[PDB]
Amino acid sequence: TKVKYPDGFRSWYHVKSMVIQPGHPLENPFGGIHHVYANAEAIQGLRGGNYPDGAVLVVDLFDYQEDNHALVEGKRKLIGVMERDAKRFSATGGWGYEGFGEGKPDKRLVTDGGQGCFGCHAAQKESQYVFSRLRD
Amino acid sequence: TKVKYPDGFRSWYHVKSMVIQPGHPLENPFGGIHHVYANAEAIQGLRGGNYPDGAVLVVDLFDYQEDNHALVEGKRKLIGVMERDAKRFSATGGWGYEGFGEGKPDKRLVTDGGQGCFGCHAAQKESQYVFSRLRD
Ligand code: HEC
Ligand code: HEC
Ligand SMILES: [Zn+2]
Ligand SMILES: [Zn+2]
């Protein structure tokens, strides 16, 4: 009942990106440039299907440096991972919630079995707990 | 002698992102959040392998909006496209250069056979006229 580290996530479908700057309510700790990645299974959910067991969403969070009016990606801060399993992750609405510090499998960030993650993602129950929207 | 519209580039490997903000010397026309994509052939060349003919790099440029210390992706402004053909695009260092307004296949932008594009990209002869570097 631990989220598997999503090996190869970096080769998945890039869903969207956002910059969270200092002053954002979520600055600690989602401050930075982030990219959302979906595996094949998660794409079915993003396209308007039911999220199937084995869907994985990853949010990939980088530091950035403001250099002469460019924001330039620096070090990877962490990844967030949502792993679909309606049974095993039933306590958090069928998604397993995990963080990996610097995107390393040995740096698990989640210490409450994902209740805090779920507490915010709950606001999106009607879109199956996923904020990101597919775009061209 | 024309660069093909890179159908499906949104499914390709996401190489990197950067934000160019007001004040940047390249604000016209490179202002916004841009995402770099690489097909399989392009990935070979980015890894320090060589670029096969049919390698395609895309730079996907979005407008952004400020939204309470978040930069949020808005409308697509354009895509830039580099298509590898050592012989056919030999006048511009073996890469064909094209822009598509709003990434629409019908809004081709380049009028000088890509000499303008190649001029800036020539700074990067040492790495085959590619600025982007693979990251983790
Ligand atoms: C609100 C106060 C949040 C808490 C606590 C957590 N997340 Fe979150 N998450 C949030 C938003 C507003 C977004 C969308 C960002 C965007 O670019 O639109 C996200 C996104 C994710 C993603 C990408 C999938 C998606 O739902 O869009 C993942 C994989 C994700 N978040 C995981 C995650 C984990 C593991 C958390 C606990 C450590 C967590 N999030 C907390 C808002 C909030
Ligand atoms: C300098 C003033 C530039 C001119 C004119 C053009 N491009 Fe460019 N390009 C430039 C930089 C500094 C970068 C890297 C951006 C980053 O995030 O690192 C790019 C990138 C591209 C890419 C992605 C591949 C790469 O080399 O990194 C493509 C596909 C690309 N640019 C195409 C392109 C075309 C078609 C142009 C003429 C319309 C063009 N570029 C002009 C700098 C400059
Ligand atoms: Zn403020
Ligand atoms: Zn600035």
Numbering used by the authors:
A (entry chain B), B (entry chain A): 3 to 138
Provide text from the study.
Cytochromes c′ (cyts c′) are a group of putative NO-binding heme proteins that fall into two families: the well-characterized four alpha helix bundle fold (cyts c′-α) and an unrelated family with a large beta-sheet fold (cyts c′-β) resembling that of cytochromes P460. Of these, cytochrome P460 (cytP460) is a heme enzyme that oxidizes hydroxylamine to N2O as part of nitrification (1), whereas the evolutionarily related cytochrome c′-β (cyt c′-β) binds the diatomic gases, NO and CO (2). By contrast, our recent crystal structure of cyt c′-β from Methylococcus capsulatus (Bath) (McCP-β) reveals a hydrophobic distal pocket dominated by two Phe residues (F32 and F61), a structural feature we have named the “Phe cap. Proposed roles for cyt c′-β proteins include protection against NO stress generated during nitrification.
The F61V variant exhibits Fe–C distances of 2.01 and 2.00 Å and a similar bent geometry to the native ligand–bound structure with Fe–C–O angles of 166° and 177° for monomer A and B, respectively. The F61V variant still displays two possible conformations of Phe 32 in the presence of CO. Similar to the wt Fe(II)CO complex, two orientations of Phe 32 can be seen in the F61V crystal structure. However, unlike the wt structure, where a unique Phe 32 orientation was seen in each monomer, F61V displays two orientations in both monomers. RR measurements of F61V and F32V Fe(II)CO complexes support our hypothesis that the local negative polarity of the Phe 32 aromatic quadrupole limits buildup of charge associated with Fe(II)→CO(π∗) backbonding, thereby weakening the Fe–CO bond. The pair of ν(FeCO) frequencies observed for the F61V variant (483 and 495 cm−1) are similar to those of the ν(FeCO) doublet for wt McCP-β (481 and 491 cm−1), with the lower frequency ascribed to CO interacting with the local negative polarity of the aromatic quadrupole of Phe 32. In line with RR data that indicate a modest weakening of the Fe–CO bond (because of the Phe 32 aromatic quadrupole), the CO off rates of wt and F61V are 1.5 (±0.2)-fold and 2.5 (±0.3)-fold higher than that of F32V. Crystallographic and RR data confirm that NO and CO ligands interact with the Phe 32 ring face in the F61V variant but are unaffected by any aromatic quadrupole in the F32V variant.
